[PDB]
Amino acid sequence: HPETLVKVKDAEDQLGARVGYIELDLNSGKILESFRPEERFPMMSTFKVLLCGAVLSRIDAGQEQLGRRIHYSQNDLVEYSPVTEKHLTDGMTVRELCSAAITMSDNTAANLLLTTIGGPKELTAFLHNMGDHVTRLDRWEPELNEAIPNDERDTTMPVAMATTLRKLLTGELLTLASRQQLIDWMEADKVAGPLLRSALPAGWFIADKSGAGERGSRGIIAALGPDGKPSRIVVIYTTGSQATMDERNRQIAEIGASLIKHW
Template sequence: MTFIFKAQVSICNAFLLSFLIHIGLAGSARANTILEQIEAQEHLLGARIGVSIYDVKANDSWDYNGNTKFPLMSTFKVLACAKLLADVEKGLQSFDTATVITTDSLINWSPITKKLVGEKISLKEACSAAMIMSDNTATNIVFKGIDGPKALTQFMRAIGDEFTRLDRIEPELNEALDGDKRDTTTPNAMVKSLHTLLFGDVLSRDSKVQLKQWMIDNKVTGSLLRSVLPEHWFIADRSGSGGFGSRGITAVVWSDKRTPLIISIYLTQTDATFAQRNKAIADIGKAIFAVYRK
């Protein structure tokens, strides 16, 4: 586990740099608070867990299995909608492009689109449904609008992320087979990419505001980090779940007194119940907040 201090460079090139200074945290009581909670949850769930934390103002990071691959699950939806925003800015796509919802197009977990059979949904509305309610049919509409998983992977490479990859659409991308490189990311890669998208210059100010607002308006993460968020703090997040006990969340948290903190937590390969996995993420989040609110 290390705090990592990086040279000040453009965010889009961050993945190309080596970390310059590494300061061991083995003796740090603050870091051990987080480490002990993660290891306890790994033992309790029999899971593999990865965590990455980036303090935006201090420009330092901490991770546990930060460079280990984990299934992306629905955390990728923030990336897909970011690409749509970028494509709209470039004139390659329009928010108003519409698709008719059909019964045949509906897949599992489509709480918004299942009510719209026979009606049209725009790409902007589809992103809203995908981000706020994790609607999978809407997500596949977004996929079509951004030219599919391969194009999204190319977008990630273009913004400096050499690790995150999308290979399939919903629901197959959530398969989460152990050792499968398809549809994966690393906690560090996701944190850095979220930093690039929300704080860098890949997107315009208006697009960054929209992306962040979709994450703020998320309605399906109440039992995760939101359940242990310190009083007067704010959160913008996107979660995911998949096969083999996979669960994940990527988030930005902040307050009037605390500058933004970007967090990614992923776990996989466990027989734990959905509720147990949610509690594990919440407990890890609680430990993180206990350290970083000081």
């Protein structure tokens, strides 16, 4: 972990905004290092992994079917829906919705999936029930991305998010089958290339989900490690900055480059 905290500091100085950071050991669950681990930041799309974890738990309990086909309409389409827009005529199965929501950050897929579970309140109740009393989802896409200053709607804390993600990927919360699927969806993430993946050395494993919002909000949650095997959870959030997206990504990418070097 060592030197990564100056970078987190530097990043805070380059972006002129708050940066929240936490590295957790996947196996033990012990915190390795942190910075503002207990301040709230907008989750943005990083919530979609929590969403599909909830969907997968329902599958496990016979409440939902990955192969169930959901038929939606034009009224349901929202900003940033590359996969759902293409399958509008034929619909999509619950499995295809999570794949789109996580790997392509499809917003309509997330809204559809939220509807299958009862909405943002039920995802929050799900989280609350598994010991996370910090993370909260209040709105659907695209509003949840507003990142209004001081607004606690649709927020989490780096620490709460890292622990919740760890419980979903390694607990008994989900079956090995569901854990394989959720991690594989994150492994197959196709939209987070500019962040942690840009500093990831060859042979390294990473399963992640990124998020972007207004007010320069940018974030990412990941399980990564050397030798193609994940060994640590990393959660990074930033909001408030005025720098370009490329600069915001660059800083997050540099944080990652540092935590990798001092692994």
